[PDB]
Ligand SMILES: *[C@@H]1O[C@H](CO)[C@@H](O[C@@H]2O[C@H](CO)[C@@H](O[C@@H]3O[C@H](CO[C@H]4O[C@H](CO[C@H]5O[C@H](CO)[C@@H](O)[C@H](O)[C@@H]5O)[C@@H](O)[C@H](O[C@H]5O[C@H](CO)[C@@H](O)[C@H](O)[C@@H]5O[C@H]5O[C@H](CO)[C@@H](O)[C@H](O)[C@@H]5O)[C@@H]4O)[C@@H](O)[C@H](O[C@H]4O[C@H](CO)[C@@H](O)[C@H](O)[C@@H]4O[C@@H]4O[C@H](CO)[C@@H](O)[C@H](O)[C@H]4NC(C)=O)[C@@H]3O)[C@H](O)[C@H]2NC(C)=O)[C@H](O)[C@H]1NC(C)=O
């Protein structure tokens with residue numbers, strides 16, 4: 001059984017880029033989003049955190 | 050003594066209300082707000 005090591009296929013929508021085990025691993029680590037697209041505006045709309 | 054909060058002891062020569070920030074929004078300006086000085090740009094924000 002190699003289900004968790006494979007990327008789940010989706011019939012309609014956007015293709016996924018994470019496997020089940022990768023999703024489990026990434027959800028256990030807290031990483032801040034470094035505002036690649038609109039970080040400058042978001043830091044003003046969100047306020048000091 | 051200088052306080053990080055408002056400084057309420059000022060000379061009369063420094064008493065002015067040139068608060069024309071609405072017309073100076075998109076420009077680097079020198080600000081002197083209740084004893085706090087510096088340079089920066091003011092952007093309209095909601096908070
Ligand atoms: C050749 O190679 C090319 C490059 O590899 C490739 O092109 C790429 O294609 C993929 C897949 O098609 C594209 O991915 C998609 O990107 C969308 C846009 O992402 C940006 O914007 C979002 C914010 O959205 C705002 O802006 C977009 C326009 O840009 C606008 O449409 C939207 O309305 C908003 O205004 C932003 O969040 C993205 O950045 C984050 O994610 C990146 C990774 O994707 C990170 O690298 C980045 O650091 C950001 O990370 C942070 O945020 C995420 C999300 O919260 C956190 O996980 C993370 O920890 C961190 O905090 C980026 O700037 C994007 O909207 C779209 O999203 C859908 O798909 C993914 C994967 O399945 C899901 O996770 C999403 O939830 C979402 O799924 C569903 O999608 C459908 C259809 O779109 C929607 O109807 C659903 O609503 C939606 N569901 C939900 C629940 O949201 C996806 O990631 C990629 O952008 C392309 N890259 C380019 C063009 O450069 C190309 O295809 C290849 N060609 C071939 C032939 O193979």
Ligand SMILES: *[C@@H]1O[C@H](CO)[C@@H](O[C@@H]2O[C@H](CO)[C@@H](O)[C@H](O)[C@H]2NC(C)=O)[C@H](O)[C@H]1NC(C)=O
Pocket residue numbers: 001002003004020
């Ligand atoms: C192979 O393993 C996957 C998990 O990696 C199993 O899928 C799970 O199946 C149970 C029982 O039906 C469900 O409750 C879970 O939600 C499933 N997890 C998923 C899809 O991530 C799968 O059943 C296994 N295959 C076999 C033939 O036993």
Ligand SMILES: [Zn+2]
Pocket residue numbers: 091092093
């Ligand atoms: Zn601005």
